[PDB]
């Protein structure tokens, strides 16, 4: 394809550095880097002719002749994770699109001590919580549900913890049972 | 650069109108489509006021540049295919610079018959004291439930103010039941506190579901309640227990 990215999709931790690679099948005019967070806003990162450019914690550098873009990121937070498109002008003068890089920033779990708690309704359907596992735990898996992880930070506290969450409206289900 | 509408539900076979508007006077505007496998795309094209140029899928729309700051997408017969998140963007040819300029997206669902479309039911958990012993933390789970289409903003307001740590949503709703075409959707979220705020009866929990459906102008006969776009929320106050 006319843009190229990789790697399609990226695990790191936070606080380590990544570099996201962008390839061009033509001789390019120019680059543009974007960040496409939850929201789905396409957030610029770089516009580039030529050369490199440093944006806060992220680098990105253009060689039109070898025709590659790569982008840099240092020091990873969770803010981090989202989609990153690299998009190029061909010599006809249209911005085509790579299919993202789909990043994903993990904590570094400090005291790993996972857990499976029963939260009822707080009005008058069971809800099974699954926490403060590591971050290199994998959650898996008909009248029953199970979400895929997610990560909090309680900044209050500077502390942060992944869950995931099961329910069902089965009689036979048990949160010792669950995931 | 500005878009509206931000969601829209259509029915299949009806007309959609998507509009952009740029305050930069940029003499290029753009209409692409996200999808899946295919970044962005370009649709149809604007190298001044008054003219429009078809992209590379242009099949199915038409586009109207009625002004320098206007580009408006035009599906004169809505298709399936056709949902998708669609973005509008402008640029400037008299610079050298060819750097594009994005608006936020609109959320695009074409539907068979309006029937599919369902509001969530919202409940919010409260937190285990087993959690609060072995951890003096709290979480509370919110489960937003049945709904469709898939998209949703959920957000907790605390003591009446929207809260931005120790929050963390789904990154995907999931479907209720996988083997079924336009199955309804599921999404959860965690708010976690210390045990001793949750514990305090003075401090009010809410889970907010945003819900994009219906417009007003969209006909609605049925017996349910009409499920146009609205805020679903379920509260709970803290207790010591």
């Known amino acids: 394809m006319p843009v190229e990215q990789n790697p399609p999709a990226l695990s790191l931790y936070e606080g380590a550095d990544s570099g996201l690679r962008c390839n061009f099948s033509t001789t390019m005019k120019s680059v543009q880097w974007f960040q496409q967070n939850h929201r789905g806003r396409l957030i610029t990162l770089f516009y580039?002719?030529?050369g490199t450019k440093e944006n806060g914690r992220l680098k990105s550098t253009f060689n039109s002749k070898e025709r590659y873009s790569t982008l840099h990121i240092k020091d990873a937070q969770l803010e981090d994770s989202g989609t990153y498109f690299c998009?190029?002008?061909?010599?006809?003068?249209?911005?085509?699109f790579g299919t993202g890089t789909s990043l994903l920033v993990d904590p570094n779990i400090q005291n790993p001590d996972p857990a499976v708690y029963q939260l009822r309704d707080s009005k008058s359907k069971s809800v099974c919580l699954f926490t403060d596992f590591d971050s290199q735990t994998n959650v898996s898996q008909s009248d029953v549900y199970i979400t895929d992880k997610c990560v909090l930070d309680m900044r209050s506290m500077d502390f942060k913890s992944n869950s995931a969450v099961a329910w069902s409206n089965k009689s036979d289900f048990a949160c010792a049972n669950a995931f | 650069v500005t878009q509206s509408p931000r969601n829209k539900v259509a029915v299949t076979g009806g007309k959609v109108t998507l509009s952009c508007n740029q305050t930069n006077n940029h003499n290029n505007m753009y209409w692409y489509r996200q999808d899946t496998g295919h970044g962005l795309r370009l649709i149809h094209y604007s190298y001044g006021a008054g003219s429009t140029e078809k992209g590379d899928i242009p099949d199915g729309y038409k586009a109207s540049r009625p002004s320098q700051e206007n580009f408006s997408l035009i599906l004169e017969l809505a298709t399936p295919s056709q949902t998708s998140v669609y973005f509008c963007a402008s640029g400037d040819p008299q610079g050298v610079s060819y750097e594009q300029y994005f608006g936020p997206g609109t959320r695009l669902t074409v539907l068979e018959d309006l029937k599919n479309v369902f509001p969530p039911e919202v409940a919010v958990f409260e937190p285990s004291e087993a959690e609060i012993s072995h951890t003096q933390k709290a979480t509370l789970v919110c489960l937003a439930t049945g709904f469709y289409p898939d998209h949703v903003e959920l957000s907790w307001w605390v003591n009446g103010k929207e809260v931005h740590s120790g929050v963390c949503t789904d990154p995907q709703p999931l479907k209720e039941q996988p083997a079924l075409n336009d199955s309804r959707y599921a999404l959860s979220s965690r708010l976690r506190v210390s045990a001793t705020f949750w514990q305090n009866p003075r401090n009010h929990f809410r889970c907010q579901v945003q819900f994009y459906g219906l417009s007003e102008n969209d006909e609605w006969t049925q017996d349910r309640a009409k499920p146009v776009t609205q805020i679903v929320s379920a509260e709970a106050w803290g207790r010591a227990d």
């Open positions: 998009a190029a002008v061909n010599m006809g003068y249209k911005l085509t």
């Open positions: 580039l002719a030529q």
